[PDB]
Curated annotation (Swiss-Prot), chain A:
Cofactor note: Does not require a metal cofactor.
Protein name: CRISPR system Cascade subunit CasE
Highest classification ranks of the organism: Bacteria, Pseudomonadati, Pseudomonadota, Gammaproteobacteria, Enterobacterales
E.C. numbers: 3.1.-.-
Class of this enzyme: hydrolase
Organism of provenance: Escherichia coli (strain K12)
Swiss-Prot record, chain B:
Effect of inactivating the gene: Loss of resistance to bacteriophage lambda infection, loss of plasmid silencing. Increased levels of 57 nucleotide crRNA and also 2 and 3 spacer-repeat units.
Gene: casB
Induction context: Repressed by H-NS, activated by LeuO. Activated by the BaeSR two-component regulatory system, possibly due to envelope stress. Part of the casABCDE-ygbT-ygbF operon.
UniProt subunit comment: Homodimer. Part of the Cascade ribonucleoprotein complex, with stoichiometry CasA(1),CasB(2), CasC(6),CasD(1),CasE(1)-crRNA(1). The CasB homodimer forms a cleft that cradles the 3' end of the crRNA. Interacts directly with crRNA, CasA, CasC and CasE. Stable subcomplexes of CasBCDE-crRNA and CasCDE-crRNA also form, both of which are able to bind target dsDNA. Binding of target ssRNA or dsDNA causes a conformational change in the Cascade complex.
Keywords of the record: Antiviral defense, RNA-binding
Protein name per UniProt: CRISPR system Cascade subunit CasB
Pfam families noted in UniProt: CRISPR_Cse2
Chain segments annotated as transmembrane: none
Listed GO biological process terms: CRISPR-cas system; defense response to virus
Family indicated by similarity: Belongs to the CRISPR-associated CasB/Cse2 family.
From Swiss-Prot, chain D:
Phenotype upon gene inactivation: Loss of resistance to bacteriophage lambda infection, loss of plasmid silencing. Increased levels of 57 nucleotide crRNA and also 2 and 3 spacer-repeat units.
Function: CRISPR (clustered regularly interspaced short palindromic repeat), is an adaptive immune system that provides protection against mobile genetic elements (viruses, transposable elements and conjugative plasmids). CRISPR clusters contain sequences complementary to antecedent mobile elements and target invading nucleic acids. CRISPR clusters are transcribed and processed into CRISPR RNA (crRNA). A component of Cascade, which participates in CRISPR interference, the third stage of CRISPR immunity. Cascade binds both crRNA and in a sequence-specific manner negatively supercoiled dsDNA target. This leads to the formation of an R-loop in which the crRNA binds the target DNA, displacing the noncomplementary strand. Cas3 is recruited to Cascade, nicks target DNA and then unwinds and cleaves the target, leading to DNA degradation and invader neutralization. CasCDE alone is also able to form R-loops.
InterPro entries for this protein: CRISPR-assoc_prot_CT1975
Induction annotation: Repressed by H-NS, activated by LeuO. Activated by the BaeSR two-component regulatory system, possibly due to envelope stress. Part of the casABCDE-ygbT-ygbF operon.
From Swiss-Prot, chain E:
Phenotype of the disrupted gene, per the record: Loss of resistance to bacteriophage lambda infection, loss of plasmid silencing. Increased levels of 57 nucleotide crRNA and also 2 and 3 spacer-repeat units.
Molecular function, one GO term: DNA binding
Quaternary structure annotation from Swiss-Prot or TrEMBL: Homodimer. Part of the Cascade ribonucleoprotein complex, with stoichiometry CasA(1),CasB(2), CasC(6),CasD(1),CasE(1)-crRNA(1). The CasB homodimer forms a cleft that cradles the 3' end of the crRNA. Interacts directly with crRNA, CasA, CasC and CasE. Stable subcomplexes of CasBCDE-crRNA and CasCDE-crRNA also form, both of which are able to bind target dsDNA. Binding of target ssRNA or dsDNA causes a conformational change in the Cascade complex.
Function noted in UniProt: CRISPR (clustered regularly interspaced short palindromic repeat), is an adaptive immune system that provides protection against mobile genetic elements (viruses, transposable elements and conjugative plasmids). CRISPR clusters contain sequences complementary to antecedent mobile elements and target invading nucleic acids. CRISPR clusters are transcribed and processed into CRISPR RNA (crRNA).
Origin species: Escherichia coli (strain K12)
Name of this chain's protein: CRISPR system Cascade subunit CasB
Keywords from the named record: Antiviral defense, RNA-binding
GO cellular component, one term: protein-containing complex
Leader peptide range in chain numbering: none
Length: 199, 156, 357, 356, 154
């Protein structure tokens, strides 16, 4: 597992799709299939590009558009019952089936993921996702701008929520699994990266 | 091969979300980044590049607000519709030196200034005229804008 | 030191759903080089006007609107038993000022704060048209010589006397020009709210200072009431009354929160911190938090301490004369100054009611 | 070192908008390649003139207008019991070079600061002009001798003695030309500022959507600079004593240290006091603006490193160009020049010409 | 049939120092289009009729040399620009060769620089008509007049 800080040129950073496709070229294997990586956008505006915190299973190699600043080999050593700081940009949703009777490819009724617009439901979603791995001691749900994107031929939305707070570890391997694999949908759109720190 | 007034109408009928996405933009080049723009402007000119710049300008002006630019048809006695210059002059909130600076601006900058004027003016004008001037936006069009403003104030 | 009353409030509560942009994110402001959660002045003010405490202790809130068409129905409804409808139409049309033709759609430049009282008063005065009739311009000339009589009517619409209003396309442009008397600042956190954590470095410290609170936030609210200007705005009125209203304002600023949800420490005490200070010139203690208040135990205690020290330095450094009273109750930390300590918020309010006696 | 007294003020402001332009944008200025929030010197000066402290300690503020039709009525009311009205009428026309014919609207060339005292004085002289009666040219030729006698009257309007006035028409062009004596800079922030945008609405109580508006606002550590030429101030007041001038100087220090423009203070209320005030005497004026040419960066706020940078640059300039003049500093934060614990002691230190 | 009056000249004489300062500070007639004081000046004659615009640009541009550069003198026919520049004696004929060979904006520039250096006396309506057309025959006639007068006064 490798943790890095990467910057992407503005000309290759208009949509989250462009961020994904641009970050992709740091690991040349086809088809891996991958992503074996997660990332979190901290600064969105140029120059030089957009700053990103990239967790991966390989060592990134800088390209023309994607520039690595620092790289780290890291082993998460988590102890039980220890208070920690956490940050997680996530996509809290509810899969429901459409009030409009739109049709998918199979001729059945289409489903839609909808944002949870109430704090209680978001926090409930969070502690639910964590489960027996950890218990949320304190949480700040930061409301973000709705993100839009393009490609391949579809224009869609990703409403994100940025959780920042304190938690306590109950089970370490489960939490390591949560960090490594990611939490929630839109993992390719810069969600699911759980960042931890000591207080 | 010409852009219709329908765009304006479309801009009027579009939902608040996309309008919010479009309104908060600094430069016309930054307008390219957002998808709602492509969805709005798709019927009229893409992918024929001849209109693209113009469209970028037009929508940008429209990006001032949903009801900033108030459209008024030309009277049968008027023969020609109220022009952008005449509009900004009639508003009474605009000082001529900023239109001077508008005529002295270059590329993206001018649009930046122009939008800023519209929001402060809440002008009434014939939209096809403004669209026509924005399509080319040559030196003569700028100078004509200034003509209309200064002449309108001096004559009335 | 008097005529200006300063209201300093430290109130801790949720930093999440208070005041937002049009793009679904909490309002903020940069102070001391760090980003802080913000609640706009208008948000606090409206939160006060439509509060229950306002309705019980101050009176009816003003009706701010732009639709005169919807307005005429309400006016005729509430005060039709008192006056004639055509007359109401006349004084309305004059007062705004566009002809009311039952067109069911009249919008005029607004939003403008309308109180039913003054409108009824103009209904009383327009009776002079039933006399001669006297030319409206002449009536304007007469009414301009004595605006204070109009100001007396704003006792039923205090919020206008506090925040003020402006007119542009109405006769009231000469009659309803009200400024003051309360100056209110935007509520900003005394501390940085987003975690200042270099996670990239943090992963190294995983094997192994003050704790940070996330669901709570210490906001600093400032207010200032010009007592003389309030007296003028309410029509020639007793100082004591202006200080009473001032106390109500102190309480509201001390307790109220947008969305009407309570403080994080609301269950124990009525307020987290409130200091009141009489002065010749307005003074804000925002610069007590220019240096970002880092977390010690919580954010409240060090915020209070910082406030205390800055108040010491400002008080001694410039002028330490004015009447002041503090409600802290925080653990064992003193303001080395000539300030009266109050055990309860009600004692503080009472202390203000007596002009700092 | 004397004659020039330099006033330096570091004052931090909470989120506000103390100065706008014609398009409601926050006034700014590029310094060191980076954007700074700016407060106009004219704005500070007017904020001083119309302040209560000015009324209490200095007195009458000059009234500036072009509407001579209104000024006719005003002068007729304030000087009616003292002089004949035809005399006032003639005097105004002599000073302005305009009408007298009871017109509904008499407008002048530009906004000129008028003081009732000077006009009263000129009425007292034109009373003597009624004797012969000497022609206007002869009277003007007579008044050409004693300019200082006209300047003595200017103590009823100090704002002119501080900021000066420019005359284009009338007999003022040869008598009312006043230079000096206070040079004040535009207040700029010591650091780079990216202005925040307040997205407000106007809630219609009679309806459930709405269109939004924007208001540019920002917080920041401003550096105000002022400078008084004592000799020029004495000349503007008709050869007044130095001791009398230094008092006005102290009042200027206090006002520059405490007065804040009332722009958007009803909605933002940035009623903050100055965190630092330094005063130094010099034979040559000197601004410490280049202390912040290299825009300060926030360590624990902008205030602390602003103070530090200011002190450092002052040391550099002082050692470099000699500068052995009286200097005193007053700060709220006690941290690393003579130190003054309070502002009153600083003003008293100025009153005694920087000595002890 | 629409002619530009001599009133323009008078107007130019009577115009304030500010606007005249704004006008004199100009390199080309298009930059004359850029400034508002010009539009305020030229409206009565007027500018709003495109048939007249070019002519007005030239005339005003020439007048922009200065308030008293072009000195009007009443007349059979009045002194022509060629005769004027020749009578001044300060102008070299080569620069007029340049003037006749110049193209578009350039010639006007060259013309203005001459006027400032010449301080000529002439009948303004003649120069106005010649500037109204400014064809090949106007150029040729200008050079002819200059050469003939200079040859006749040597």
């Amino acid at each position: 597992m490798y943790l890095s800080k990467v910057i992407i040129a503005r000309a290759w950073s208009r949509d989250l799709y462009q961020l994904h496709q641009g970050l992709w070229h740091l690991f040349p294997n086809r088809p891996d299939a991958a992503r074996d990586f997660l990332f979190h956008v901290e600064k969105r505006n140029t120059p030089e590009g957009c700053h990103v915190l990239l967790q991966s299973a390989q060592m990134p190699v800088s390209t023309a558009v994607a520039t690595v600043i620092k790289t780290k080999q890291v082993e998460f050593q988590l102890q039980v019952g220890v208070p920690l700081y956490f940050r997680l940009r996530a996509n809290p949703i509810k899969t429901i089936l459409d009030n409009q009777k739109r049709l998918d490819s199979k001729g059945n009724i289409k489903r839609c993921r909808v944002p949870l617009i109430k704090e209680a439901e978001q926090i409930a979603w969070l502690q639910r996702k964590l489960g027996n791995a950890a218990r949320v001691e304190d949480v700040h749900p930061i409301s973000e701008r709705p993100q839009y994107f393009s490609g391949d031929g579809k224009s869609g939305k990703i409403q994100t929520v940025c959780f920042e707070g304190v938690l306590t570890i109950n089970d370490a391997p489960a939490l390591i699994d949560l960090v490594q694999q990611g939490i929630g949908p839109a993992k390719s759109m810069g969600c699911g990266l759980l960042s931890l720190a000591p207080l | 091969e010409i852009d219709a007034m329908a765009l304006y109408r479309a801009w009027q009928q579009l939902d608040n979300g996309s309008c919010a996405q479009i309104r908060r933009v600094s430069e016309p080049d930054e307008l390219r980044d957002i998808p709602a723009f492509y969805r709005l402007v798709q019927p009229f000119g893409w992918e024929n590049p001849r209109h693209q710049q113009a469209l970028l300008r037009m929508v940008f002006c429209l990006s001032a607000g949903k009801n900033v630019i108030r459209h008024q048809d030309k009277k049968s006695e008027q023969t020609t519709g109220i022009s952008l210059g005449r509009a900004l002059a009639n508003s009474g909130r605009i000082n001529e030196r900023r239109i001077f600076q508008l005529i002295r601006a270059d590329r993206t900058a001018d649009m930046v200034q122009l939008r800023r004027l519209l929001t402060h003016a809440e002008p009434v004008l014939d939209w096809p005229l403004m669209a026509r001037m924005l399509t080319w936006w040559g030196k003569r069009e700028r100078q004509q804008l200034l003509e209309d403003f200064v002449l309108t104030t001096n004559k009335n | 030191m008097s005529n200006f009353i300063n209201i300093h409030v430290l109130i801790s509560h949720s930093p999440s759903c208070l005041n937002r942009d049009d793009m679904n994110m909490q309002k903020d402001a940069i102070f001391g080089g760090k980003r802080r959660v913000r609640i706009s002045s208008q948000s606090l003010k409206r939160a006060m006007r439509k509060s229950g405490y306002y309705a019980q202790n101050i009176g009816e809130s003003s009706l701010r609107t732009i639709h005169l068409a919807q307005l005429r129905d309400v006016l005729r409804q509430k005060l039709g038993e008192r006056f004639d409808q055509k007359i109401i139409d006349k004084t309305l049309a004059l007062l705004s000022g566009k002809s009311v033709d039952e067109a069911e759609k009249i919008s005029a430049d607004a939003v403008t704060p309308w109180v039913v009282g003054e409108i009824a008063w103009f209904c009383e005065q327009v009776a002079k048209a039933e006399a001669d009739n006297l030319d409206d311009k002449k009536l304007l000339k007469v009414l301009k010589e004595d605006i204070a009589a109009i100001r007396v009517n704003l006792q039923q619409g205090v919020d206008i006397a506090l925040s003020g209003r402006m007119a542009t396309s109405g006769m009231m442009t000469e009659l309803g020009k009200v400024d003051g008397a309360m100056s209110i600042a935007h509520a900003i956190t005394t501390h940085q709210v987003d975690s200042d954590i270099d996670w990239f470095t943090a992963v190294d410290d995983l094997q192994e200072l003050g704790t940070q609170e996330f669901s709570s936030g210490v906001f600093y609210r400032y207010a200032n009431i010009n007592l003389a200007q309030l007296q003028e705005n309410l029509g020639g009125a007793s100082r004591e009354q202006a200080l009473e209203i001032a106390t109500h304002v102190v309480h509201m600023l001390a307790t109220e929160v947008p969305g009407a949800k309570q403080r994080t420490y609301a269950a124990f005490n009525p307020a987290d911190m409130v200091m009141v200070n009489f002065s010749d010139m307005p003074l804000s203690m925002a610069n007590a938090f220019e240096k970002a208040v880092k977390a010690k135990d919580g954010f409240l205690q060090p915020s209070i301490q910082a406030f205390n020290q800055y108040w010491d330095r400002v008080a001694n450094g410039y002028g330490l004369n004015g009447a002041a009273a503090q409600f802290s109750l925080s653990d064992v930390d003193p303001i080395t100054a000539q300030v009266k300590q109050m055990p309860t918020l009600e004692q503080l309010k009472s202390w203000v009611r007596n002009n700092g006696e």
